[PDB]
């Protein structure tokens, strides 16, 4: 069953990466065609795609009466799209980020600083309805401030090239966890925190091979948005859906490096920009994330 399981790593592997490249082609021609910023499109339909995992890890892990995980997940996308993630691109492909954009992460610091406020206690299921409509209004009010709209084939085959791409990055992603599950499980390898907080990492793979993706084809705005969106798409999404099946426990420790990694992001798009020494400085705060937190 090892034999199966390498079978399924490298070609999930090699799913995730032409998928994500046909995910990122995709999603920039549909932003063209409707008439909409590159961060938008990244904010909207890649960010809520490619959060599709967390949504759908937190609504079981809450259902099967685990919310610490519910919420673990949640929350460690965050700090990893920001630290790893947005780490990496900002290197790949450094981003000067234009006032309409800086208002946006604004907002974004804004919505991150009261899901902490009100988390503070935990997350119960009203806190999870309104940070889902919060949700829905950033979804819209980013679409309105980012389209400039005035208007069957040139759309079909972007339409096409974009939900292929998710597929691959989505089924990607999982045969990259199965293969690796497999691997361990034949070499009897197998813990479990190791196969939680890699199924913790599996969720996020996704937004890390698109942003790198769009990073090569120095899509500054897409990479930006898929993790400003991807982040409320799981506290906003995951992490709320996740408490309407059970309280989720209070993480204020990771809370906190989410604001000061946030606080951190808005900081530098506002006054400076986001190139490599900024890029280092996230990768630098992932690196001690992952080595102090658990
Ligand atoms: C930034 C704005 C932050 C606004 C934070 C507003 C917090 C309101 C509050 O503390 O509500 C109690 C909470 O519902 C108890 O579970
Ligand atoms: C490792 C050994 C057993 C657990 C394997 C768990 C493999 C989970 C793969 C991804 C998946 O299928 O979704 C996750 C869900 O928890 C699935 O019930
Ligand atoms: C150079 C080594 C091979 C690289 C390409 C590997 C492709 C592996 C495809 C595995 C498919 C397994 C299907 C199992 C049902
Ligand atoms: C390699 C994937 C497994 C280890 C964790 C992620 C490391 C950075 C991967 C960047 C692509
Ligand atoms: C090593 C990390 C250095 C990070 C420097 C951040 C600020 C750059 C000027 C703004
Ligand atoms: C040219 C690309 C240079 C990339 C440098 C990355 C430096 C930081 C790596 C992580 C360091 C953690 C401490
Ligand atoms: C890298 C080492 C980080 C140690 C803790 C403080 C980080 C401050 C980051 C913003 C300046
Ligand atoms: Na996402
Ligand atoms: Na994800
Ligand atoms: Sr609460």
Redo the contacts with the bound molecule.
């Keep these: 069953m090892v034999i199966l399981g390498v079978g399924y790593f490298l070609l999930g592997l090699i799913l995730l990466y032409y998928g994500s490249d046909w995910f990122v082609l995709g999603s920039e021609r549909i932003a063209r065609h409707f008439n909409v910023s590159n961060f938008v499109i990244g904010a909207t339909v890649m960010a809520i795609g490619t959060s599709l995992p967390e949504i759908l890890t937190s609504a079981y892990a809450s259902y099967m009466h685990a919310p610490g995980i519910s919420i673990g997940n949640a929350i460690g996308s965050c700090i990893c799209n920001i630290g790893l993630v947005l780490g990496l691109s900002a290197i790949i492909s450094p981003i000067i980020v234009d006032k309409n954009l800086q208002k946006n992460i604004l907002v974004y610091l804004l919505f991150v600083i009261f899901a902490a406020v009100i988390g503070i206690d935990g997350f119960s299921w009203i806190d999870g309805v309104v940070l889902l409509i919060l949700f829905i209004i950033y979804l819209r009010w980013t679409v309105k401030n980012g389209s400039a709209e005035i208007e069957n084939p040139s759309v079909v085959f972007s339409l096409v090239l974009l939900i292929i791409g998710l597929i691959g990055v989505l089924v990607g992603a999982e045969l990259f966890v199965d293969g690796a599950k497999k691997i361990a499980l034949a070499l009897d390898i197998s813990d479990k925190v190791i196969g939680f907080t890699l199924v913790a990492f599996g969720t996020s793979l996704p937004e890390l091979m698109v942003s790198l993706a769009a990073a090569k084809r120095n899509l500054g705005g897409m990479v930006l948005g898929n993790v400003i969106g991807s982040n409320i798409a799981d506290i906003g999404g995951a992490l709320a859906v996740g408490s309407l099946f059970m309280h989720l426990p209070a993480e204020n420790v990771q809370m906190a490096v989410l604001v000061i990694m946030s606080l951190l992001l808005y900081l530098?798009a506002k006054?400076?920009?986001i190139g490599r020494?900024?890029g280092?400085?996230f990768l630098?705060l992932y690196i001690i994330a992952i080595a102090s937190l658990r």
């Design positions: 530098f006054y400076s920009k020494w900024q280092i400085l630098a």
